[PDB]
């Protein structure tokens, strides 16, 4: 059983297990190890016909792997992963390649990558999207690390990766050195928060303003998805709106408490954007939208005390349903423009030469945010790899021009009717700000110099200036 | 030469003045600064005063009466760490060290723990009020152990601004370890909000009502007579007056639209994301700062990205009042957000923050000095466990009376292509906060659908998963 296995996996929770099964199905012997043996063993018996190699101790596991050893870690992010890494280090050899496919915070990977390079060991921080089903059938993957070591891992990753239905291209490509992989995966997770919120706002509008029924709302997303929006998330939405309550009358969607899921890791993209000095209103608005929703108890109380308009809709339903559709797409565009500009900045800061156009290609399948318009992002970067912002490319220039009007009315209609659209309003503000040649930042600048002499720059000559306000 | 009663390190704008404040209370004040040149430059001018000029840290530390009371006003982070590292050896059991800068609170929290049982008294304190504040009387936000605090209170009270309504000094005990610096970071957070709300109104007036600086300076004057009466509005019309010192035209037109920022605003937002606190407005103004540094692409994008060039054809004075309401309204949203974060932070760190007091000490020597802070104090006198300020009557009323106007201002400004990030934030927040039901229901449904994440129900307790297949 010594040196038999081509690839190894540590962590036999559903994720690791599924991955090991994925890799096995592509024609490999794969060694599986878990801390709690009864899990490993439990996996072995269910999958004895497969070419999995059962291992009881780290020793057996490391010992079972062909060299250079390719080991994927699918354990709990944080202390656990460092624990696991520390347990393997003695037993490993120079040139062996460790792979962390957990939902890891990028600095963790940047630190680990560097530490282990001193010990000779290669380290590939790799984002694995698509959940348990993807891990088994086809994930989208975002690896980063030593490029030489990755090249030796790439074949497997490429065989197991999800295949884009438009061209069967594997949803995996090298991101860059150290932690570039995990950083791309983060922005991805941020972006997901944006889309989900943007859909939420769309739903909220049709439901509340146009008094639409779930069934009516289903039909709309159904249609919208035939067009340019076309996205798995929209497909999920029309699927969820079909379903009956399993414990009572009506729709499950109307029975699910409006309190959003525990933070969690979704805040990271916004933390990074704050850190790098990058404007990311949309995604950050999405996060707080989640947050504010967890204040349900407070909202109930406020709902009974604070006044809002009690308007009643009289416009044209067909006209508005189409303006919101434009609002949706325009806003979605704003989010990506921001998220792709974040990547561009992080790519300078850390020196990564991030392949922006491929990122979009490898998001086409095996993840949540998969959508037809991702191609337009690739087109854009093909045209100019150095493109500062998605908005400045022929396709998005056009969409924004023909669509901006609708946003505005959607904004006025919602705001007048008192329906909360934090991300829609944000999208249109990012727009008008980005194109504003001059901003009133001049006044802020004056204020800070006035009270604290923080010094400003001038519009007319180069240099640093402090006006004498006293 | 143990002569001096108090000592100030770092003779830039803040440390300089602070040392002059302390001096004006009839003490003799050690002045050290790392760059000798400025220490002598301050001694030489203020000969008349009782300043003890020193050149090495050992001098300065020797030259203080025991127990020594030392207050640092140095640039935050590395700059402050090294300054304190130098100092600790030189000091004696019973001495008092004060970090008066904009230190990121975790630095202080850690420092406090480190320094706790080594017999040196440490205070992390926030100081608001800028140069005039530091000179004449600043807002002070001391945190640390109560015994430490009690030794500096007498002199803090003396140098602190006095509230004009009651003469109560704008300094109080904030809480254990980092409580103080934390409070000041929220001060600066709210500050960025106010400023972006101010700037946006400048824009609206200048760009939709096509108003001149004198016309606008006049508008901010009249506003400061009303309920808006506040330091920031005040310094605005003060700015709008001044003329270029190097050319024709108004100074405020020759400053480049690129906001500098020194961390505190960013830190507030970071803490909000960290605590689960919804802090849209301040975070929107942080990003408003960011996107302003993107001047180059804004210049580029202005020539390619189309937008409304539609003229304003309505009643000017009617729409000016409408903006004033929205400005008042939005300020209230910000402070609500700010205070709720402080609530959450308080219970995270076991601080027991005096919310009412915090409003009280903000009445003066404070950049976010504003008349309507008293109202915040009432609200907390009325119920110290208040969850959000919007629930309090005084504010329930204002929102009810001003919300319709906000909506009109937001509508006009969007249709006129003029960017109002914090204004749009204000009404969104208010509209979310008052909804019994948000579309989080759909979101949750989605999360359970693709990722098995589970969810709560509207009708029964427990966590549930839906067999979506
Ligand atoms: N300005 C305001 O409106 C205001 C308001 C409240 C609080 N604060 C806080 O008060 C503190 C200082 O006030 P400031 O803004 O007037 O000054 P600052 O520019 O932030 O800090 C400069 C002071 O720190 C010293 N310093 C800078 N870098 C150093 C280094 N690397 N090593 C050792 N010393 C160093 C400088 O000495 P050199 O002369 O040698 O450079 C100078 O005395 C800061 O922490 C600031 O956040 C400022
Ligand atoms: N501190 C740790 N040390 C070693 N392995 C761990 C640790 N924490 C979690 N794991 C492993 O990671 C996987 C669980 O990840 P998650 O918590 O994200 O579902 C499991 O295989 C678990 O093994 P075990 O089955 O022995 O607990
Ligand atoms: O603490 C202060 C006032 O409250 C300082 O003036 C501070 O530096 C201003 O904030 P920033 O420079 O980040 O805009």
What do you see in this structure?
Chain B: Its EC number is 1.1.1.44. Chain B: The active site is at residues 184, 191. Chain B: Homodimer. The structure is a homodimer. Chain A is of the alpha/beta class. Chain A has three domains: 1-182, NAD(P)-binding Rossmann-like Domain (Rossmann fold), CATH 3.40.50; 183-437, N-(1-d-carboxylethyl)-l-norvaline Dehydrogenase, domain 2; 438-470, Single alpha-helices involved in coiled-coils or other helix-helix interfaces. Chain A has helices spanning 14-25, 37-46, 58-64, 79-88, 106-118, 131-137, 147-160, 180-208, 214-224, 232-242, 268-276, 281-293, 296-303, 317-350, 356-361, 374-383, 394-417, 422-435, 441-452, and strands at 7-10, 30-33, 52-54, 70-73, 97-100, 122-128, 141-144, 456-457, 464-465. Chain A has a seven-stranded mixed β-sheet with strand order 3-2-1-4-5-6-7, with helices on both faces. A two-stranded antiparallel ribbon of chain A has the order 8-9. In chain A, helix 8 packs across helix 12. The first copy, chain A, is globular, with a radius of gyration of 25 Å. The termini of chain A are far apart. At the A-B interface, helix 8, helix 10, helix 11, helix 12 and helix 13 of A face helix 6, helix 8, helix 10, helix 11 and helix 12 of B. The site of NADP nicotinamide-adenine-dinucleotide phosphate has 21 residues of chain B, from helix 1 and helix 4.
């Amino acid at each position: 059983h010594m040196a038999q296995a081509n690839f190894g996996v540590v962590g036999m929770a559903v994720m690791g297990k599924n991955l090991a099964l994925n890799v096995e199905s592509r024609g490999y012997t794969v060694a599986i190890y878990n801390r709690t043996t009864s899990k490993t063993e439990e996996v072995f018996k269910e999958h004895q016909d497969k070419n999995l190699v059962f291992t009881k101790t780290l020793e057996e596991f490391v010992g079972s792997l062909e060299k250079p050893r390719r080991i994927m870690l699918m354990v709990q992010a944080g202390a656990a992963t460092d624990a696991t890494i520390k347990s393997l280090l003695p037993l490993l050899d120079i040139g062996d390649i460790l792979i962390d496919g957990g939902n890891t915070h990028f600095p963790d990977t940047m630190r680990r990558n560097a530490e282990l390079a001193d010990s000779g060991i290669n380290f590939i921080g790799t984002g694995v999207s698509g959940g348990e089903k993807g891990a088994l059938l086809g994930p989208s993957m975002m690896p980063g690390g030593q490029k030489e070591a990755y090249d030796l891992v790439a074949p497997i990753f490429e065989q197991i990766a999800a295949k884009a239905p438009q061209d069967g291209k594997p949803c995996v490509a090298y991101m860059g050195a150290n932690g570039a992989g995990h950083y791309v995966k983060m922005v991805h997770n941020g972006i997901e928060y944006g889309d989900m919120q943007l859909i939420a706002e769309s739903y909220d509008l049709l439901k509340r303003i146009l008094g639409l029924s779930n069934a009516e709302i289903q039909a709309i997303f159904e249609e919208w998805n035939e067009g340019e929006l076309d996205s798995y998330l929209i497909e999920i939405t029309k699927e969820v709106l079909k379903r009956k309550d399993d414990e009572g009358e009506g729709y499950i969607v109307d029975k699910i408490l409006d309190k959003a899921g525990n933070k969690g890791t979704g805040k990271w993209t916004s933390e990074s954007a704050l850190d790098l000095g990058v404007p990311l209103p949309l995604i950050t608005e999405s996060v707080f939208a989640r947050y504010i929703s967890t204040y349900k108890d407070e909202r109930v109380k406020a709902s009974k005390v604070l006044s809002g308009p009690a308007l009643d809709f009289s416009g044209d339903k067909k006209e508005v349903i189409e303006k919101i559709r434009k609002a949706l797409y325009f806003s979605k565009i704003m989010s990506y423009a921001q998220g792709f500009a974040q990547l561009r900045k992080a790519s300078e800061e850390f020196d990564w030469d991030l392949p922006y156009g491929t990122i979009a290609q490898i998001w086409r399948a095996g993840c949540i945010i998969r959508a037809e318009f991702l191609q337009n992002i690739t087109d854009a970067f093909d045209k100019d790899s150095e493109l500062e912002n998605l908005l400045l490319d022929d396709y998005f220039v056009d969409i924004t021009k023909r669509y901006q009007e609708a946003v505005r009315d959607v904004v006025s209609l919602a705001v007048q009717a008192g329906t909360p659209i934090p991300t829609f309003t944000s999208a249109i503000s990012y727009y008008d700000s980005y194109r504003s040649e001059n901003l009133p930042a001049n006044l802020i600048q004056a204020q800070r110099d006035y009270f604290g002499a923080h010094t400003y720059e001038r519009t007319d000559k180069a240099g640093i200036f402090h006006y004498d306000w006293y």
